[PDB]
């Protein structure tokens, strides 16, 4: 299926192209230097690859996008919903070495140019947030964790009350994520879901036989956003699988657990 609203600009990097002034992109599976099971572009420093190939594969993102890699933001992603406002003094935070990602983070935005924020993804919902109005970027995390918690709603609610933002304004798009084709849970997974302030919580869930759903993480998501305030017409969600596109993307359901992360971009200029 295409990768619309993403763009291929081959092997590396998906690049969000009506927004680009903002950069925005999630990157592909090629290109890299990390070796199996993190075949090749692995962008994580929190999966056991070796550390110099992550660095060296994020070193060239970071030159493709014209930019140093002493100017981007990582998070320690414990699937909550934690959304920090990235500001100067958070530059080059786990850019090099994790222990100064920062803590028990799943969301970021900021207004500061030049500051490129960064999340690693392997099957989890990447979801972008971008207010012109406002001059906003923001990129969130959300498995079936994140997605119970609404960190795709915090992410409005906070540019709303502390930003000042029109939700009207907002503009989100949700990247590559396991499709309801590959992702199937348990009633713990499926209680907590259906406990979000949506009311249509089932349009994304089906029962297969008892105790095991079939569940599309992508449609919670873009629905907890409308709920949220931004309107539907303001919203791409892409139709790429991370576990069904083999050429293009790790996949931690697919590859038995044991995997590289692609991450998701997003920063003004
Ligand atoms: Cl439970
Ligand atoms: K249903
Ligand atoms: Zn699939």
Same mark, same amino acid.
């Given at each position: 299926?295409? &990768?619309?609203?993403?763009?291929?600009?081959?092997?590396?990097?998906?690049?969000?192209? %009506?927004?680009? @002034?903002?950069?925005?992109?999630? #990157?592909?599976?090629?290109?890299?230097?990390?070796?199996? =099971?993190?075949?090749?572009?692995?962008?994580?420093?929190?999966? @056991?690859? /070796?550390? @110099?190939?992550?660095?060296?594969?994020?070193?060239?993102?970071?030159?493709?996008?014209? #930019?140093?890699? /002493?100017?981007?933001?990582?998070?320690?992603?414990?699937?909550?919903?934690?959304?920090?406002?990235?500001?100067?003094?958070?530059?080059?935070? $786990?850019?090099?070495?994790?222990?100064?990602?920062?803590?028990?983070?799943?969301? !970021? &935005?900021?207004?500061?140019?030049?500051?490129?924020?960064?999340?690693?993804?392997?099957?989890?919902?990447?979801? &972008?947030?971008?207010?012109?109005?406002?001059? !906003?970027?923001?990129?969130?995390?959300?498995?079936?964790? $994140? #997605?119970?918690? $609404?960190?795709?709603?915090?992410?409005?609610?906070?540019?709303?009350?502390?930003?000042?933002?029109?939700?009207?304004?907002?503009?989100?798009?949700?990247?590559?994520?396991?499709?309801?084709?590959?992702?199937?849970?348990?009633?713990?997974?499926?209680?907590?879901?259906?406990? !979000?302030? !949506?009311?249509?919580?089932?349009?994304?869930?089906? #029962?297969?036989? %008892?105790?095991? &759903?079939?569940?599309?993480?992508?449609?919670?998501?873009? @629905?907890?956003?409308?709920?949220?305030?931004? =309107?539907? $017409?303001?919203? %791409?969600?892409?139709?790429?699988?991370?576990?069904?596109?083999?050429?293009?993307?790790?996949? /931690?359901?697919?590859?038995?657990?044991?995997?590289?992360?692609?991450?998701?971009?997003?920063?003004?200029?």
């Amino acid at each position: 299926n295409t &990768y619309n609203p993403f763009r291929l600009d081959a092997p590396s990097m998906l690049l969000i192209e %009506e927004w680009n @002034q903002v950069t925005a992109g999630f #990157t592909t599976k090629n290109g890299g230097e990390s070796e199996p =099971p993190f075949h090749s572009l692995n962008t994580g420093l929190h999966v @056991q690859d /070796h550390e @110099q190939h992550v660095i060296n594969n994020r070193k060239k993102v970071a030159d493709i996008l014209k #930019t140093d890699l /002493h100017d981007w933001v990582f998070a320690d992603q414990t699937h909550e919903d934690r959304i920090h406002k990235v500001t100067d003094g958070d530059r080059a935070s $786990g850019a090099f070495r994790y222990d100064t990602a920062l803590k028990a983070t799943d969301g !970021l &935005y900021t207004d500061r140019p030049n500051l490129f924020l960064a999340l690693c993804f392997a099957d989890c919902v990447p979801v &972008y947030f971008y207010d012109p109005v406002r001059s !906003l970027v923001g990129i969130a995390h959300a498995g079936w964790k $994140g #997605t119970a918690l $609404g960190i795709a709603a915090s992410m409005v609610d906070m540019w709303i009350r502390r930003e000042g933002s029109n939700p009207a304004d907002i503009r989100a798009v949700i990247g590559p994520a396991i499709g309801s084709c590959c992702y199937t849970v348990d009633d713990h997974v499926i209680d907590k879901i259906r406990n !979000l302030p !949506l009311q249509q919580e089932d349009k994304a869930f089906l #029962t297969i036989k %008892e105790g095991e &759903y079939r569940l599309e993480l992508k449609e919670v998501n873009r @629905q907890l956003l409308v709920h949220a305030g931004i =309107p539907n $017409g303001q919203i %791409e969600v892409s139709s790429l699988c991370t576990s069904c596109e083999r050429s293009l993307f790790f996949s /931690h359901r697919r590859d038995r657990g044991k995997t590289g992360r692609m991450m998701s971009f997003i920063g003004l200029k």
